[PDB]
Design a protein around this nucleic acid. Structure first.
Ligand code: CL
Lengths: 194, 187
DNA sequence: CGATCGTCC
DNA sequence: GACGATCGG
């Protein structure tokens, strides 16, 4: 009955009231001395100078590659978003396998434990809302605060990669689909916000 | 890394696949069977079963997408079209509907009957979304939006406001893709 | 009761 | 592969 949609005409007319580069409603930077963590608007204090944050930041700066376990104390969220987004398009990178099960050193686990420790949350579990399904992907709030819809690819790809319901070949098809969808969006968004 | 920062790298990216062409290793299920599990696997059909007929006339009476879909209810292309359109309808609560849909006793009866005729791999993270193999066999990259959105909706790491931002992000990315692919594969 | 997901085989 | 902790319908 809905020939307007199956023919593509409906999607050809798509538009919204949101502007790229402007903050998503209710989103914004974390308070001073704190970093984004958990749900929308939630935050935890910073761990700059702690032994866990200092060890991980040095490994991150000495490698030039995206960190396996990322935290805002390691550097710019825009830099880790750019690295992961690029990794999703680089040939023979096996990015979906890296997002689900990255090679983790003991320093990455300590950084992850210290990040939840300072948060003051009661219980850590599979149900705890963290704002990122994969620890390598920065908190989604930084994309919401910056109005960077192209940074949603990293989260959408990581959600598919973390799911236990698709096999390797099925995940590869979804990465190809996501690649096609986001490539013109990323090109337009990066050109405008620079 | 100015090529990627300026966006020129992403404007140049091109794959080697063609919309409408079968994905490598993917195809229709064997005659008399329906796609199931991982890539290439399948299970026998239930087209004449009562549970499949009780949920078919329910899905055929209401022009809305089924809450628990199965190939015995109709063509996968129809359910994919309804879910994709629903993901773009303002105030549809599509992400919450994918995660926790209203389920009748007839839906779980059809659910149970599919496991009996047949690992954690199912080929669809949400039961309303048809098996991914149907999109891979049809070369429908636009049918990945339903799976990508459903994966986000099923995740426990984002709250509702965070999922809403990703829905708009997925909307803006897939809208030009869907307009081009739907027009090319339907005329 | 189902799910995700940390954590092993 | 699985087992379990742990939340929402
Ligand atoms: Cl194409």
């Amino acid at each position: 009955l809905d020939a307007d949609a199956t023919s593509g005409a409906f999607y050809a007319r798509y538009r919204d009231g949101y502007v790229s580069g402007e903050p998503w409603p209710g989103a914004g930077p974390p308070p001073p001395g704190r970093v984004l963590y958990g749900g929308l608007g939630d935050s935890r204090p910073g761990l700059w100078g702690a032994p866990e944050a200092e060890e991980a930041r040095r490994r991150f700066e000495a490698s030039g590659a995206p960190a396996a376990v990322w935290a805002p104390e390691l550097g710019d969220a825009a830099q880790q978003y750019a690295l992961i987004t690029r990794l999703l398009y680089t040939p023979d990178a096996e990015a979906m396998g890296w997002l689900q099960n990255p090679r983790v050193v003991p320093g990455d686990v300590a950084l992850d434990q210290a990040c939840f420790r300072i948060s003051g949350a009661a219980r850590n579990s599979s149900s705890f809302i963290t704002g990122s399904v994969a620890r390598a992907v920065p908190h989604l709030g930084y994309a919401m605060a910056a109005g960077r819809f192209g940074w949603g690819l990293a989260h959408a790809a990581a959600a598919v990669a973390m799911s236990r319901r698709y096999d390797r070949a099925q995940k590869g098809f979804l990465l190809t689909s996501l690649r096609r969808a986001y490539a013109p969006l990323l090109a337009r968004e990066n050109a405008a916000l620079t």
